[PDB]
């Protein structure tokens, strides 16, 4: 995992550890906004024309 993704996950873990589920969910939604829903494991480099 990248540095930033790990850092965001650690922040969510710490917020959960502080027994504060309110900003935990906010931080998780921020994670979703910044990194989206899925992670791309395979692409196809190429080109197309119509």
């Amino acid at each position: 995992l990248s540095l930033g993704f790990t850092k965001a996950l650690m922040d969510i873990c710490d917020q959960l550890e502080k027994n504060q589920t309110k900003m935990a969910t906010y931080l998780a939604e921020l994670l979703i906004l910044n990194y989206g829903t899925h992670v791309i494991t395979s692409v196809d480099a190429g080109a197309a024309l119509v």
Partner: protein, 50 residues
Amino acid sequence: TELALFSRVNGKFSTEFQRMKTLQVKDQAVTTRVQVRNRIYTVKTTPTSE
């Protein structure tokens, strides 16, 4: 018209009318629309920025 009386009194009367008319109408309407749109990159801020 030709009128001869008594084989002595001659008369002729030739009348000609001639009309010529010409009309020409020529319309041209040329419309041209070119529309190019290039999108090269999509630049985004890193989620870990300050």
